[PDB]
Amino acid sequence: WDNLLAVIPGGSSTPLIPKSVCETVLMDFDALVQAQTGLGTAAVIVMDRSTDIVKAIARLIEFYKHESCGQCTPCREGVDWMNKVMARFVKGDARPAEIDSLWEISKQIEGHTICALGDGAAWPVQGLIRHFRPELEERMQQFALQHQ
Amino acid sequence: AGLLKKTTGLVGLAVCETPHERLKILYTKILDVLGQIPKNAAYRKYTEQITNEKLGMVKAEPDVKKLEEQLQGGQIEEVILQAENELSLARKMLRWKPWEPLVEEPPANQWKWPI
Amino acid sequence: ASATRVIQLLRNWASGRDLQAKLQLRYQEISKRTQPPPKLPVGPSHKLSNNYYCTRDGRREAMPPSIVMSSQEKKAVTPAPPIKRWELSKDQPYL
Numbered sequence A: 001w002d003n004l005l006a007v008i009p010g011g012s013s014t015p016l017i018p019k020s021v022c023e024t025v026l027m028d029f030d031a032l033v034q035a036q037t038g039l040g041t042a043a044v045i046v047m048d049r050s051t052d053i054v055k056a057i058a059r060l061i062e063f064y065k066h067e068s069c070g071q072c073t074p075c076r077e078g079v080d081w082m083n084k085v086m087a088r089f090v091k092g093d094a095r096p097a098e099i100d101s102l103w104e105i106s107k108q109i110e111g112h113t114i115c116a117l118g119d120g121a122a123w124p125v126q127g128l129i130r131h132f133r134p135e136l137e138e139r140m141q142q143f144a145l146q147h148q
Numbered sequence B: 001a002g003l004l005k006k007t008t009g010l011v012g013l014a015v016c017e018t019p020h021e022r023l024k025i026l027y028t029k030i031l032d033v034l035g036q037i038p039k040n041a042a043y044r045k046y047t048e049q050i051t052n053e054k055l056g057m058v059k060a061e062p063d064v065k066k067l068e069e070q071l072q073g074g075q076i077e078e079v080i081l082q083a084e085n086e087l088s089l090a091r092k093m094l095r096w097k098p099w100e101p102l103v104e105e106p107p108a109n110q111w112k113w114p115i
Numbered sequence C: 001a002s003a004t005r006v007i008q009l010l011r012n013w014a015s016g017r018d019l020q021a022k023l024q025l026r027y028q029e030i031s032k033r034t035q036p037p038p039k040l041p042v043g044p045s046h047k048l049s050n051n052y053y054c055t056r057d058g059r060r061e062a063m064p065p066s067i068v069m070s071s072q073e074k075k076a077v078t079p080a081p082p083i084k085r086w087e088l089s090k091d092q093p094y095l
């Protein structure tokens, strides 16, 4: 249990949750909804301290960019924009306010898309922002001094 | 009151040496001419409101130096000038009589900018 | 500046004041005409955090004039409080 840093609860779209949230929650629709996620397809992916969460959702959001049909502007443009800024986040090439922007454009594509893939892309990054905020700051902070 | 101030600081407007009673007799005069205009008139009610009220302390308080801030309208020597102007208005709108409804409603939508 | 002292007394005495303290023309005191490049600030709303134009809509927040009375016991008021007699100059009231 101590090894697992966070868990994808029920699907890639469903925002991942850490041990601090998943210590007692039952995998049910109502409890998942109040856990700021969803059970969806019960795709439970457990993920440990060793692996980096930003890299974990990096491949997910890269996959999402590889699957948007491009029909509506928010999904066609926003997901690609998310991929580029997040790729910097893996190294940490941003400022404190970029997480707030990544928060901002996530809400912009949340629900404004024709289909539920756009907000389906909002939720994973949205959960990542809300939970491991200090992790983003320190990895981004590490980016600054190593490339001083 | 006190020593008669040499000049008012406004060229053309002189200093009246007996200002308090001149302001008195003016204020009665506008009250007098305001008798003609019937009671329902709003202009009458407005100036029958500020005349006697402003006639109050000028009748009571005799010091024109304190009368400056009693009326908060600058020097007394031009307050009476303004009082004369109010008397001129009473004479003027005794002809105007604007208590009737509008002469004309505005022709169609001549107002309502923009076009 | 060039001007010898005996000339300076003549100018100072005739005008009744000392002029070498400050002169009409310029001298080395001016800033050099090759000032370093500047680093002009950014706008107050330049942040890439929440900055939606839905907040600042100066042109759009304008409202057509408010309707108060249209053709289609009372108090007496004034458009503004009467002005306040400002006091004399503290540094030099009577010039």
Ligand code: SF4
Pocket: A067, A068, A069, A070, A071, A072, A073, A074, A075, A076, A113, A114, A115, A116, A117, A118
């Ligand atoms: S959100 Fe759906 S409809 Fe819009 S571009 Fe993406 S896949 Fe197409």
